[PDB]
C-alpha cells in the first residue's frame, strides 16, 4: 500500500523552515544594528553578542538552516508529487535527514558563538560538523534520487533536474572545500588542506557554487514546481528549460574567480571567471523568463493571490541579481564593488528578494496542503507579509548600493595633488546612515517573517490528523 504521500517530513521541515527563518533573520537584524551602534556588541567580555562571531551564525542559520529547511520541505513535497510516489527513504531515511539537519543547525548555533570556525565563508563549521553534514546529505540524496528511481511517470520533471543537480553538486562542493586536517576536537580545530591562492580558489569555487546550486538551482526547482501550481493552465517553454538548465549547470561552476578579481589569484583564472560569469547571464535569465512567461494571461491573478505575488516578485529580484552579478563579475566593475557594501547589496537582493520570497510563497502554498488544510488561515496576512517583505528588500538594496558606491568611490578617490581624498574613517562615517536604513529594512522584512509565523501557527492549530485523505 503506502499509496499516500509521506507528508510527515515535509511538515516538520516546513515548520522548522519558518522557525529558522525567524532566528536567522533576527540575527541579521541584530548584527546590522551592531554595525549601526557597536554597543550592541558586549564591550567587556566576548559574551553572547559580538559581531565577528555572530556574523557567520547569521550566514549559516540563514542559508543552511532557513534556506536548507526550505529546500528539504520543498524537495520532499515537490518530488513526491511531481513523480507521484511516496518518499523513498520514508520516515526512516527522510526523518533521519530531518533530525540530522536539525542537529547540524543546533551545533552551528552553539559552536559559532563559542568561536569555533574555519574562517571559510559558508564553510565555517568545524570538521566534526562537516562529517555530520556529509552523512546527512548522503542520506538526503539517497532519499531524493531513490524517490526519482521509484517514480511512476516515464519523464522526470525539470524541477527535479534542478533539485537533483543541486543535491549532487553541493555534496561534491562540500566534501572538497572541507578537506582539512584535524588538530583538535572542534571549532576550527582543523587547518584547511589548501593555502593561499589555491585555498582562495577552492573556497570561492565552493562559495559561489553554494549560492549557485544551493541558492539558485535548488530554488529554481522550487520555482518550477510552485509557480506553475495555479488554477490557470499552460504557458511555459520546455526547450528553454533544457537549454537554461544545462547551460546554467555547466557554466556556473566556472564563476568562482569573479570573487577573486584583482587579487593574488592568477590573471588567467580571474579572466575565466569573468568570461564565464558573463555567459552565465543568459541561462540564469532563462530561468526568470521561463517562470514569468508562464504567468502570461494569468497576470490578473497577481492582484488576487498574494502567494503568486510572492513567487513573481521573487523572480523579479532573481533576474535583477542575476544581472547585477555578471556586471560585478567584470573586472573593472569589481574594481569598485569589491570589499564594499555593494557586495552585501547584491547578496540580500538575491537572498531576501529571490530565495526568501520564493521559499515564502512555496511554504504558503504547501503548508496548508501538508497540514490537511484547504488554505492558509488568513490571505490578508500573506498580502501584508508580501508588502513588508518587499519594502524591506528594496530598502536594504537601496541602502547598500548607496553605501557601496560611496565606499568604492571614497576609497579610490584621488585629489588634484594626487593624494588620497578620504580617510577610511571618513568612508566609514559616510556609511552610517546606510547601516541604519539597512537595519530598518531588514527589520521590516523580519517583521513580515513574524506575521508569517503567526499566520502559519494559526493554520497549524486547526487539525490533528491532517493526512489530507489519499494525498
Amino acid at each position: 500500500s503506502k499509496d499516500e504521500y509521506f507528508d510527515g517530513v515535509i511538515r516538520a521541515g516546513v515548520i522548522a523552515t519558518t522557525f529558522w527563518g525567524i532566528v536567522g533573520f533576527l540575527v541579521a537584524v541584530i548584527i546590522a544594528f551592531q554595525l549601526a551602534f557597536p554597543a550592541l556588541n558586549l564591550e567587556f567580555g566576548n559574551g553572547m553578542l559580538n559581531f565577528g562571531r555572530l556574523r557567520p551564525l547569521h550566514t549559516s542559520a540563514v542559508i543552511f538552516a532557513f534556506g536548507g529547511n526550505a529546500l528539504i520541505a520543498s524537495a520532499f513535497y515537490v518530488v513526491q508529487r511531481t513523480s507521484a510516489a511516496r518518499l523513498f527513504g520514508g520516515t526512516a531515511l527522510g526523518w533521519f535527514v530531518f533530525w540530522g539537519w536539525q542537529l547540524i543547525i543546533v551545533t552551528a548555533a552553539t559552536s559559532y558563538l563559542l568561536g569555533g570556525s574555519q574562517g571559510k565563508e559558508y564553510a565555517e563549521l568545524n570538521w566534526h560538523l562537516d562529517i555530520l553534514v556529509a552523512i546527512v546529505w548522503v542520506a538526503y540524496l539517497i532519499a531524493f534520487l531513490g524517490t526519482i528511481f521509484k517514480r511512476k511517470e516515464p519523464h522526470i520533471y525539470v524541477a527535479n533536474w534542478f533539485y537533483l543537480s543541486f543535491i549532487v553538486t553541493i555534496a561534491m562542493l562540500h566534501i572538497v572545500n572541507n578537506l582539512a586536517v584535524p588538530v583538535s576536537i572542534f571549532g576550527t580545530k582543523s587547518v584547511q588542506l589548501m593555502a593561499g591562492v589555491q585555498d582562495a580558489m577552492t573556497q570561492w569555487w565552493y562559495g559561489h557554487n553554494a549560492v549557485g546550486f544551493f541558492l539558485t538551482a535548488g530554488f529554481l526547482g522550487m520555482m518550477y514546481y510552485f509557480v506553475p501550481k495555479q488554477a490557470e493552465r499552460p504557458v511555459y517553454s520546455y526547450k528553454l528549460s533544457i537549454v537554461h538548465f544545462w547551460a546554467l549547470i555547466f557554466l556556473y561552476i566556472w564563476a568562482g574567480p569573479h570573487h577573486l578579481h584583482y587579487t593574488a589569484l592568477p590573471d588567467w583564472a580571474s579572466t575565466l571567471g569573468m568570461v564565464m560569469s558573463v555567459i552565465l547571464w543568459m541561462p540564469s535569465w532563462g530561468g526568470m523568463i521561463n517562470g514569468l512567461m508562464t504567468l502570461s494571461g494569468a497576470w490578473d491573478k497577481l492582484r488576487t493571490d498574494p502567494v503568486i505575488r510572492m513567487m513573481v516578485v521573487s523572480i523579479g529580484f532573481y533576474g535583477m541579481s542575476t544581472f547585477e552579478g555578471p556586471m560585478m563579475s567584470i573586472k573593472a566593475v569589481n574594481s569598485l564593488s569589491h570589499y564594499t557594501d555593494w557586495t552585501i547589496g547584491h547578496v540580500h537582493s538575491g537572498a531576501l528578494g529571490w530565495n526568501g520570497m520564493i521559499t515564502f510563497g512555496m511554504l504558503y502554498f504547501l503548508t496548508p496542503r501538508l497540514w490537511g488544510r484547504s488554505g492558509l488561515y488568513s490571505l490578508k496576512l500573506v498580502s501584508w507579509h508580501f508588502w513588508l517583505a518587499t519594502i524591506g528588500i528594496v530598502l536594504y538594496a537601496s541602502s547598500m548600493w548607496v553605501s557601496g558606491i560611496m565606499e568604492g568611490l571614497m576609497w579610490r578617490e584621488v585629489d588634484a595633488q594626487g593624494f588620497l581624498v578620504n580617510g577610511f574613517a571618513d568612508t566609514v562615517g559616510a556609511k552610517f546612515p546606510m547601516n541604519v536604513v539597512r537595519g530598518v529594512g531588514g527589520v521590516l522584512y523580519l517583521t513580515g517573517g513574524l506575521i508569517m509565523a503567526y499566520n502559519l501557527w494559526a493554520t497549524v492549530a486547526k487539525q490533528p490528523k491532517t493526512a489530507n485523505l489519499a494525498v
Partner: peptide, 30 residues
Amino acid sequence: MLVKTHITKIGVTLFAVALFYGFIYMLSNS
C-alpha cells in the same frame, strides 16, 4: 500585452538617468 510592454518601457529612462547621474557623481568622487 501592450499594456505590459508599454509599462515596461515606462520608467526605464528614470533609473537610466538617475544612475548616469550617480556615475558622474562617482567619477566626481573618486
